[PDB]
Structure 1
């Protein structure tokens, strides 16, 4: 219980926003702000079927991206109930994927989609049935 140093990797876009926030909010380093973000954000996956929504924003000019997300969905074990796509601007589409699955299936789907080249983000909203 004592100070440890570890490494973190960010895409330029996130790193750039980080550095602006450090400057805007009066922090003295990346380490200091990230450390504070972790402390703040720190304050059980199971087999039960849950409905979830994954919002993905992606580059609509990235070839085979939709195919790779389909491939990911097909293998995930989740059941896709619906997907909707709209063009949000000149470079990006926004897709919502409404799906059912257990925690492990849905989490893996979100992380695999999120790490695709051309995917700007993939944010999951989960509703377990106690939430309704």
Structure 2
């Protein structure tokens, strides 16, 4: 409606990995993709602060052998019964596990639970995904 240009300083290695992925997706340029990022952020954020009701999936990959991650995960999960519905676990290989934990409840409490889990030791990856 009325465009304003500004500049940003970013480590070159990083900006290039971006350009590669973005180039792949079909984007015409950066401003375009960065705005998406920005636009999505704002939205994902108002929910996170929302403090309402969300249903979510916490996907995580972890080497069950590195530390007591397997221990911690359960203890942490059993600590939040009301918010944790059930959990799917797929043994990816001799050492690695993929586990998606379904959670329902107050976005605030859930976004803080997702954090606790993903903040764990053996946790390699992980991401929360919410719904209205």
Fold conserved between structures, TM > 0.5? yes
Pairs within 5 Å for 1:1-132: 21=17, 40-43=36-39, 44=46, 45-76=49-80, 79-128=83-132
Seen in structure 2, the aligned counterparts of structure 1 residues 22 and 46 have a Cα distance that, compared at 3 Å, is closer
Shift of 1:92: 1.1
CA distance in 2, matches of 1:22, 1:127: 28
Q: Secondary structure at the match of 2:65?
A: coil
Q: In 1, distance between residues paired with 2:18 and 2:84?
A: 40
- Structure 2: 5+ residue runs without aligned partners? 22-31, 40-45
Name whichever structure is richer in helix by fraction: 2
TM-score by length of 1: 0.62
CA RMSD of aligned residues (A): 3.6
- Give the ranges of 4+ consecutive aligned residues of structure 1 lying more than 6 Å apart after TM superposition: 1-7
| Cα shift at 1:63 | 3.2
Q: Aligned in 2, Cα 1:78/1:21: closer, same or farther, shift over 3 Å? A: farther
Q: TM-score, normalised by structure 2?
A: 0.62
Matches of 1:3 and 1:111 in 2, distance apart? 32
Q: 1:6–1:122: structure 2 CA closer, same or farther, 3 Å change rule?
A: same
**CA offsets 1:69-126 (integer angstroms, 9 cap, x no match):** 2333344575211112111123310111111121111111111211222111111121
Q: How many residue pairs end up in the alignment?
A: 114
